[PDB]
């Protein structure tokens, strides 16, 4: 996260760390949607142009973390993956369309003060909140700069959703209905963005109707970090909800 700040303890208890077994390294962010299911970006696991093709046995999921590098004894929980599911129509050849994936835990994790799931949006929640000008929140342990450092603790930043036309005019990549963009305008005099290591993490919003936190987006792509005139692109969770339900119902939950 570029231009964010240290998160408060227990502030994003659904925040998950995707962790490479060997070498030991941070791969991406992710989110806890139930006691057995993790949500992330497909490109975190599969990206052939870079020879990336991770498997169950390659990864570890760390939940309830605050510190980036420390092993948080008696706080964090480490879990093993039972199965990975990538959207059957994820488009890694062109524009990362449908950049979404589900991971089923080997065993349910137990909730605590630091570990708790986020809600998936409903049609009406999406309709009400996903509006230009509305702010959302992004979290992660990614870089602090495009070419710098690295945070010691989880970072946080609030960003406004941007009008579709402005999003489209900022890039040469083909935008779809399965994506949205966010960030401040060069004009706005406020910055911030996700960056390397933050991919696959959550973009969330707090409902003013029922006080619950909802995951509206997944950190997908962006040209550099915090560039003027550029924005961050996120996977449109709601548009893909049916595929989510489908997988969770046909395979466990």
């Amino acid at each position: 996260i570029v231009e964010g700040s240290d998160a408060e303890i227990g502030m994003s208890p659904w925040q998950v760390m995707l962790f490479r077994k060997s070498p030991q390294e941070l791969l991406c962010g992710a989110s806890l949607i139930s006691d057995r299911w993790v949500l992330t970006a497909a490109h975190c696991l599969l990206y052939p142009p870079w020879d990336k093709n991770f498997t169950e046995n390659d990864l570890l999921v760390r939940i309830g973390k605050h510190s980036r590098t420390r092993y948080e004894r008696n706080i964090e929980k480490i879990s093993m993956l039972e199965k990975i599911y990538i959207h059957p129509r994820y488009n890694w050849r062109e524009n990362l369309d449908r950049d979404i994936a589900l991971m089923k835990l080997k065993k349910p994790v137990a909730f605590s003060d630091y570990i708790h799931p986020v809600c998936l949006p409903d049609r009406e929640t999406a309709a009400s909140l996903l509006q230009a000008g509305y702010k959302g929140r992004v979290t992660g342990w990614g870089n602090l700069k495009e070419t710098w450092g690295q945070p010691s603790v989880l970072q946080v930043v609030n960003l406004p959703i941007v009008e579709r036309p402005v999003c489209k005019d900022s890039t040469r990549i083909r935008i779809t209905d399965n994506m949205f963009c966010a960030g401040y305008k060069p004009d706005e005099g406020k910055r911030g963005d996700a960056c390397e290591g933050d991919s696959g993490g959550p973009f969330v919003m707090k409902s003013p109707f029922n006080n619950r936190w909802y995951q509206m987006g997944i950190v997908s792509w962006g040209e550099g970090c915090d560039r003027d005139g550029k924005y961050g692109f996120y996977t449109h969770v709601f548009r893909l909800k049916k595929w989510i339900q489908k997988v969770i119902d046909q395979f466990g939950e």
Binding site: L60, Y71, I78, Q150
Partner: peptide, 10 residues
């Protein structure tokens, strides 16, 4: 830079 995680996990 990562601190060593328990072996039960590897």
């Amino acid at each position: 830079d990562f601190e060593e995680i328990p072996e039960e996990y590897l």
